[PDB]
C-alpha cells in the first residue's frame, strides 16, 4: 500500500459503522510529527474535511457537522491512521482520502516550506442493497458515415464495473459514462461507441462487462 | 463556519491563455489559503500555499495572490496538463474548508452534438423497467439541454444525464440522457422523443421512435 492509501470496506449498511484505515509512516527524525487528516469528496457537497490529529498527540479536531459520529485514532504498531464513522447514512457515501500536513524545518537554508499530501481515495457507498451482477442490454442502431451502438449496464451493486468492447480491442470512439444510482438503489450506466456504418457488416461488436464484487462477466453481442 | 466561494464554477480556455480563479473567505484568513489541482481520477495535488508560495516541483506558470478575504490563482501559459478542477483550502482555523471547485476546460470550435436514440429491446420490457437512451456525441461546449417528450408530454423528470470528461484528442463532450419508466407506463404510450438544444444547433433536433 502506498503512503496514505485508504483501505476498508467499500459498502456499509445504513445505521452501521464505517471503519477505514490509512497507511502512515514515521518521520526521519525523532522530532518529526505530522498532522493526519480524513477528508471526503461527494459530487454535491464537494470536499469536506472530516477531522484530524497530530501524530504527536491523542487529541482530535473535528468538523462540527460530524463530530459526535467521528472517532479518529492511530495505531503505530500497524502503521494505521483510522477513521470510524458511526450511525452511517446514505449521505456518507463519498470518496474518502487521507492527508498529511507538516511544515518543513530542515535547515537554516531550507525552511518555511510545507508538505501537504493526499493519498489515493477509496469509494465507500452506504446502502442496504445486496451485491448483484448487472443486466446488460444491447443498444442497437435504429444514416451515413457513422452509426452509434452501445450497451446498457443496469441494476448492479456495488460499484464498479469495467466495460470493454471486443475484449479491449476497440477503444477509439468509446464513451463509457459514469454510473448513476437509480431510485431502486442499483447503479446503471451506458457504454457507447460510434463506428463507420460500413463496418456493421464487416465488424462484430461485443461489449464485455466485468463486475468483480459479484464475480460476474457478461459478454453481449450488439447486432442491428 | 469559514466558507470559501470560488468563481467561476467553470472556465473554458485555450492553449496559452492566462486564466484566473478567485476565492473569498467569509472572514479574514490572513494568508492561510492553499490551491490544489485535482485530475478526474486522482487525489488533489498541492499547487500553492500561504496564498502565493509555489510548492517545489509545481511549474511557475501557476501563481497565487491575495490576502485577508480575497485570493486568486492564475495559470498563465495554459497547457494540456492544466485541464482539471482547482480548489482553495482554508487552513486558518478548524474545521478546514474547501472552495466549491473550478473546472478548467479547453476551448475549441463549437461542435453540434450528433444525436441518436436507442429504444428498449424485447428483454428490457419484460424486466419490469425500461430505459430509453438518448446519446449526444462529440459536442462543444459542454452546456446542452435534453428534453423527453412521451406522446407529446414532457417526462424529462424521469430521465437523468451522464456526461463524459473532455476527450483528450478532440476536446469534445458526450452526454447520455436515460429515460427510465416502468414496463406499464412504457407500454401505455407510443411516441418517444428526445429533443436536444445546443448552441451549435440553429433549431432543436428531435430524435423519436414509435414503441413496437
Amino acid at each position: 500500500q502506498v503512503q496514505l492509501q485508504v483501505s476498508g470496506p467499500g459498502v456499509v449498511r445504513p445505521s452501521e459503522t464505517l471503519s477505514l484505515t490509512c497507511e502512515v509512516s514515521s518521520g526521519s527524525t525523532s522530532r518529526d510529527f505530522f498532522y493526519w487528516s480524513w477528508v471526503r469528496q461527494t459530487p454535491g457537497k464537494g470536499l469536506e474535511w472530516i477531522g484530524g490529529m497530530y501524530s504527536n498527540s491523542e487529541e482530535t479536531n473535528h468538523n462540527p457537522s460530524l463530530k459526535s459520529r467521528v472517532i479518529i485514532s492511530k495505531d503505530t504498531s500497524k502503521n494505521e491512521f483510522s477513521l470510524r464513522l458511526t450511525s452511517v447514512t446514505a449521505a456518507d457515501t463519498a470518496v474518502y482520502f487521507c492527508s498529511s500536513r507538516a511544515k518543513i524545518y530542515y535547515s537554516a537554508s531550507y525552511s518555511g516550506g510545507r508538505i501537504d499530501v493526499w493519498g489515493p481515495g477509496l469509494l465507500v457507498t452506504v446502502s442496504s442493497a445486496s451485491t448483484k451482477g448487472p443486466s446488460v442490454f444491447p443498444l442497437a442502431p435504429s444514416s451515413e458515415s457513422t452509426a452509434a451502438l452501445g450497451c446498457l449496464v443496469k441494476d448492479y451493486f456495488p460499484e464498479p464495473v469495467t466495460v470493454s468492447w471486443n475484449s479491449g480491442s476497440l477503444t477509439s470512439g468509446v464513451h463509457t459514462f459514469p454510473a448513476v444510482l437509480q431510485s431502486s438503489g442499483l447503479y446503471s450506466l451506458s457504454s457507447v461507441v460510434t463506428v463507420p456504418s460500413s463496418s456493421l457488416g464487416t465488424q462484430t461488436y461485443v461489449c464485455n462487462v466485468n463486475h468483480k464484487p459479484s464475480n460476474t462477466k457478461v459478454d453481449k453481442r450488439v447486432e442491428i | 463556519d469559514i466558507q470559501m466561494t470560488q468563481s467561476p464554477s467553470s472556465l473554458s480556455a485555450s492553449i496559452g491563455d492566462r486564466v484566473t480563479v478567485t476565492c473569498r473567505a467569509s472572514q479574514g484568513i490572513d494568508k492561510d489559503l492553499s490551491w490544489f489541482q485535482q485530475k478526474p481520477g486522482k487525489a488533489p495535488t498541492l499547487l500553492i500555499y500561504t496564498a502565493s508560495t509555489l510548492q517545489t516541483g509545481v511549474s511557475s506558470r501557476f501563481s497565487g495572490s491575495g490576502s485577508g478575504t480575497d485570493f486568486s490563482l492564475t495559470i498563465n501559459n495554459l497547457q494540456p496538463e492544466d485541464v482539471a478542477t482547482y480548489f482553495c483550502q482554508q487552513d486558518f482555523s478548524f474545521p478546514l474548508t474547501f472552495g466549491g471547485g473550478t473546472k478548467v476546460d479547453f476551448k475549441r470550435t463549437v461542435a453540434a452534438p450528433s444525436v441518436f436514440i436507442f429504444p428498449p429491446s424485447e428483454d428490457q420490457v419484460k424486466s419490469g423497467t425500461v430505459s430509453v437512451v438518448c446519446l449526444l456525441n462529440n459536442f462543444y461546449p459542454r452546456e446542452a439541454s435534453v428534453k423527453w417528450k412521451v406522446d407529446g408530454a414532457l417526462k424529462t423528470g424521469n430521465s437523468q444525464e451522464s456526461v463524459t470528461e473532455q476527450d483528450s484528442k478532440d476536446n469534445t463532450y458526450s452526454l447520455s440522457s436515460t429515460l427510465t419508466l416502468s414496463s406499464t407506463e412504457y407500454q401505455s404510450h407510443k411516441v418517444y422523443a428526445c429533443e436536444v438544444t445546443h448552441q451549435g444547433l440553429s433549431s432543436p433536433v428531435t430524435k423519436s421512435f414509435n414503441r413496437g
Binding site: 518521520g27 479536531n61 507538516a102 | -
Partner: peptide, 8 residues
C-alpha cells in the same frame, strides 16, 4: 496555519 506538523 492550523492542523500542520513539523519535519526536521
Amino acid at each position: 496555519a492550523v492542523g500542520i506538523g513539523a519535519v526536521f
